[PDB]
Design a binder for this molecule. Structure first.
Ligand SMILES: [Cu+2]
Ligand SMILES: [Cu+2]
Lengths: 620, 620
């Protein structure tokens, strides 16, 4: 049907068959990443050509390959061998995560470290984390995972309450060798448990909460058609899913009268980085690229009706590939429902005697993921008035360490002896703009304060200014909350009835960006996180702000290299990349399990419609 | 019962009697403001003294008086004469607002101005706005109102669509004279209507919205006792109401196990300024002090179930006094209910096999107000995890002007010939802090970036710094979104189990503050709006950031004067004043009736509890 429909089990199996038939997927090959490609720029030449991109890992050490297949034609479009020491390693595989603990359990220098702390190796859990790129020259070209230990006193015990500081091990997951075990010194292992399900900790459960029922007697107001095509209160779009990005939104458009007007071609969280600010050698290399290195969509939870979703929910169950190319469905991995959102508009007019009130509502498209200790909720919102919003919810268990005796400037104390290294959770929203079509431009709008004097005698006047970002060289911008800075994306050839280019304004939260030193490995690898907004000229191969292969990949790829092309963005097919994140100084209230904290952004129409789009909302 | 209970109809009647009997309530006397005083510090002699403060205006020109009466002892505790030219004028009375259109209709200059524009005087609505204090010497001591005209073509017509630019009148509401009429020139009167209820405009109402039913089969989880005492999910507070301030929250506390721990003594929106940034002499004096000059609680709406408030709602009907001392009930003027707020906390642990999720919820306490063209929703939220939040929702109809030919740097176009002057809506939340009691302190917390080098060789470290505001001359702070600036209120004599002073962190939205030139009259009269956070030593006569008599007061009246005392705030009974607002450059979608836009702030526990205060919430 629509070329934006979700990949089916059938197409996944066909990609396997096609790869096999071509000699690309033998018994030593593993699919590190498989995802469907978006229809190319230029419309549908005729029937759809469903292509799938695949990253093929070789467990015997042979160079991996990037291959694009056409499930439609049953062909292999291309297949290049990769020089990983140059362009980067493939995403870490599940089977390689499970390798770290077992290998360390028989290494004598690990065992020696545990014995020095009187720890039973059978109770030491290891958090296998991406290695990143530092001064370990022997690592270049190898697939390394670093391990941090946590004690789990019993089966239902939360190991995070018992971090083993002073110890870290590096493991080559292909050759299956422990390359290094570093023991900086012993630290007491925090003794208090963080078992949030233990009645001794929780105490008697509250009997005070009365139920709140959210029903929809006639069902929801949105329609799901062709599997993933949604239509709700004038909004139109396709809900896609990628194992790396999670939920992706395609063809976001609004039905303004008789015209379906495009707003956003593609919207996704293209990268997610979690950098740690503890300078201890045990953790100073700690930086997760949850989207790039781990593939967040892969870890999506199965949303259950009642627990994760209240009201009339419509679930989608995306299909992804396992490491062998077989289809694996994520049951109820995508949650869809509409919710009441208070008052939309209101006015009691004295002169006319007319009292008016209208209710607001938003369409919610979300999914939840679990990456080790953290759990993240990704929410896209569509509002009656044309506003588009994204919200990320961070929860789970805080990553722990020992709390230093003499206190710390980079770690906070959660319990006695228990510490929590400072860190950030920074996201990158890739917004492939289509404001009334692809001819778009971006302007940075700052509030302008005026001096009291001629033409402003009472000194009360204030204005606003807009600077067009013409070339990619000048499209890397920072926030300025003080002057109310925003960025408007307009179509300089689609004007409203008042003869002004139609547009949408981006409202950022103005949270701190990447804090690490500019010369740091993380500043280079996650250069996108150092600025709030980037604008590029669309290019089908520029998909992630960090590049295609983030795992153990140095700088040299991603936004900084795309931008260097210095293309024309003034009234062109453009893409907006917005950096937004949380700076977390853990607090006692975050222990033993953290309450949801949130971050996001939104876009509101700015002269897009000829008047309010909600004049037709029923009184109801 | 409680000394915090809402004023009774009987107490208002009693204040009236007491005033009458003391000869304070003569034929020419009007009650411009009446409100119950809250119990003073201590309350030792558990002896109630229900006092009421009143501002009495004299219609015949005599000096007004501030009177405090005791309803419990039927006494007139105080009665002072006010030198308004010195201390500012009393709030504007309802009867004086009406008077403006009437007196102008029989004025020759006025009628002459209308005749030149061919406007039928009986169709010309006049907006009576505060005068403020400008170059008009003959205004000092006099109660002046300024009128801007809007044509109302028919009874049910929205006059806002037809501003009459180039014209403005000044009126002495006491001597009832039109002191001046200014006609700077004729401007076409926008002809298009903005009747959002008219089917020619709305078009056929949409039939796509399905109902969303929010019920509570067992009633809500909160209990209202003593008329206004709320107990909900460990929270405890008293919902007060003031004609000037609106909903006021008293004794906000949290039951941490055995102790009911105080957090905030008194929370209220102490002022609301709406400055316009159009340098046109027709409007360059326009600044509404919605709380100070017009009294927000006075124009509260009766919240209609299903329309304004959806779900299981509990209403409170506060009682105010009319201009003659008679009690007037604001039926359903306060809306109360609890609502689902998505996920509170969640974690799927691989090592333990325990999957955990909890639903969050918030207690909503709100009221809605209409001030001429705008409508504002004031919401206070209490969350399960101890977070307190306030949110202001702005709707209504934008104040209009003519859009000048050639455009404008200070006005935007909403329709053909219809302009919308740029303006801000800036609020002042007065937070009388009581973190575990009155001994409080405030620190400004900035994120701290570190340079790569010794002790931070990988350049990944980042810390935070806190500066304690010791004296009031150091307690006037500005935002810095870039360094993640927040402000923490702690009790230095109350430590949590990790031995750190308990606290609450204030998270501002960091919107722009007052834009007017520093030397402007508005900058002086609304100096509070020029900075984000103010901390002052508590004093029972320091209630408003603009002072007690904002109407036509010259400048520097409140916050700047209080702060001038330079008292000790390091570990004292303190009050935090947070300035926050919207900077509005109206857009085409704000016309004919604007969709809700919002601002707010929130405070989160910062090491207040010894661990997560929500471990006892059930799974449900
Ligand atoms: Cu965090
Ligand atoms: Cu406004």
């Amino acid at each position: 049907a629509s070329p934006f429909r979700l990949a089916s089990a059938g197409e996944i199996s066909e990609v396997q068959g096609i790869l096999r038939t071509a000699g690309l997927l033998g018994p030593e090959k593993r699919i590190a990443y498989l995802g469907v490609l978006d229809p190319a720029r230029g419309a549908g030449s005729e029937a759809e050509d469903r292509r799938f991109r695949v990253f093929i890992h070789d467990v015997s050490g042979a160079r991996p390959q990037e291959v694009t297949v056409s499930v439609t034609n049953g062909t292999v479009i291309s297949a290049v061998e990769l020089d990983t020491a140059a362009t980067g390693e493939l995403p870490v595989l599940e089977e390689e995560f499970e390798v770290v603990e077992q290998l360390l359990a028989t290494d004598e220098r690990w065992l020696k470290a545990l014995a020095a702390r009187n720890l039973d190796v059978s109770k030491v859990r290891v958090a296998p984390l991406s290695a990143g790129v530092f001064e370990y020259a022997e690592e270049r070209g190898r697939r390394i995972l670093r391990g941090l230990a946590f004690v789990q006193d019993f089966p239902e015990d939360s190991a995070w309450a018992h971090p083993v500081d002073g110890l870290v091990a590096y493991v080559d997951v292909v050759s299956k060798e422990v390359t290094r075990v570093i023991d900086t010194g012993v630290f007491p292992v925090p003794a208090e448990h963080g078992n949030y399900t233990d009645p001794e900790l929780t105490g008697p459960l509250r009997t005070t909460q009365k139920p709140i029922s959210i029903t929809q007697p006639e069902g929801p107001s949105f329609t799901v058609t062709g599997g993933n095509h949604i239509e709700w209160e004038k909004w139109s779009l396709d809900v896609g899913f990628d194992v790396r990005e999670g939920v992706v939104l395609h063809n976001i458009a609004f039905r303004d009268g008789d015209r379906l007007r495009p707003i956003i071609n593609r919207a996704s969280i293209a990268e997610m980085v979690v950098p740690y600010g503890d300078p201890s050698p045990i953790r100073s290399w700690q930086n997760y690229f949850d989207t790039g290195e781990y593939l967040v969509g892969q870890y999506a939870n199965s949303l259950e009706l009642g627990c994760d979703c209240l009201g009339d929910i419509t679930y989608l169950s995306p299909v992804i590939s396992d490491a062998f190319g077989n289809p694996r469905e994520i049951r109820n991995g995508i949650c869809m429902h509409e919710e009441d959102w208070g008052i939309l508009a209101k006015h009691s007019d004295l002169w006319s005697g007319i009292n008016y009130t209208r209710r607001n509502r938003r369409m919610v498209i979300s999914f939840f993921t679990t990456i080790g200790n953290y759990d993240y909720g990704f929410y896209w919102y569509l509002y009656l008035d044309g506003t588009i919003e994204f919200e990320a919810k961070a929860t789970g268990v805080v990553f722990t360490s020992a709390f230093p005796e003499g206190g710390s400037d980079n770690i906070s104390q959660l319990a006695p002896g228990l510490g929590a290294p400072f860190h950030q959770h920074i996201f990158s929203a890739r917004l492939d703009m289509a404001i009334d079509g692809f001819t778009n431009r971006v302007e940075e709008e700052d509030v302008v304060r005026q001096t009291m004097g001629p033409g402003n005698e009472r000194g009360n006047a204030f204005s606003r200014k807009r600077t067009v970002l013409t070339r990619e060289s000048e499209a890397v911008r920072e926030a300025d909350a003080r002057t109310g800075r925003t960025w408007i994306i307009s179509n300089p050839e689609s004007k409203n009835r008042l003869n002004e280019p139609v547009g949408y304004k981006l409202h950022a939260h103005n949270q701190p960006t990447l804090l690490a030193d500019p010369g740091s490995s993380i500043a280079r690898r996650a250069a996108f996180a150092t600025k709030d907004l980037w604008v590029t000229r669309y290019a089908d191969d520029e998909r992630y702000p960090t590049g295609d292969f983030v795992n153990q990949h140095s700088g040299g790829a991603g936004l900084p290299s795309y931008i260097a092309q210095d293309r024309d963005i003034d009234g062109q097919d453009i893409v907006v990349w917005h950096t937004f994140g949380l700076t977390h100084f853990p607090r006692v209230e975050d222990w033993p399990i953290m309450p949801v904290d949130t971050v996001g952004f939104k876009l509101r129409p700015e002269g897009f419609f000829d008047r309010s789009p909600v004049l037709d909302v029923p009184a109801n």
